[PDB]
Every structure is written in structure tokens, then in C-alpha cells.
């Protein structure tokens, strides 16, 4: 709904900002072990419940 405390809104904003895939140049690096973000979140799979 409309209401949320600004702090909850900021936590949700940070979670949105984190829900991004890995840049590919990260995969080109010398000792790289990461290929997928593995902490990706879909709003329908798992809840944050803020």
C-alpha cells in the first residue's frame, strides 16, 4: 500500500539496487569464480517482509 516508513523504503530500495546480474567483464578476470549473482531475488519466489 501507500504507507511505509522511510527506513523501510530505503531497505527496499537497496534490495532493488542489489537485484542485478553480474557484469560480464567480471567473468573475464584472472582468478574469477563468479558467473551468476546467485543472490538474485524474484518478488514471487522469496519475500523480504519489511
Partner 1 sequence: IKKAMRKLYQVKAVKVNTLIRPDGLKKAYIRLSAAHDALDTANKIGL
Partner 2 sequence: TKGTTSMGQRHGRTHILCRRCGRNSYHVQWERCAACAYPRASRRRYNWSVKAIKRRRTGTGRCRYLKVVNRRIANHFKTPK
Site string for partner 1, 6-35 (x = CB under 8 A): x--xx-xxx-xx------------------
Applying CB under 5 A, the span of 1-9, 22-30, 32-40, 42-50 interacting with Na ion comes to 1-9
Alpha carbon distances (Å) from 6 to 15, 16, 36: 14, 15, 31
**Minimum distance, C-beta of residue 7 to RNA, in the bound complex (Å):** 5
Please list, in sequence order, all residues whose beta carbon lies within 8 angstroms of the beta carbon of residue 25, skipping any fewer than 6 positions away.
Answer: none
Which of 22, 18, 43 lies closest to 33, judged by CA? 22
Applying CB under 8 A, the span of 3-11, 18-26, 28-36, 38-46 interacting with partner 2 comes to 3-11
Amino acid at each position: 500500500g501507500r504507507f511505509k516508513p522511510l527506513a523501510v523504503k530505503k531497505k527496499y530500495a537497496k534490495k532493488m539496487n542489489q537485484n542485478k546480474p553480474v557484469p560480464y567483464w567480471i567473468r573475464l578476470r584472472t582468478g574469477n569464480r563468479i558467473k551468476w549473482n546467485e543472490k538474485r531475488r524474484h518478488w514471487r519466489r522469496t519475500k523480504l517482509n519489511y
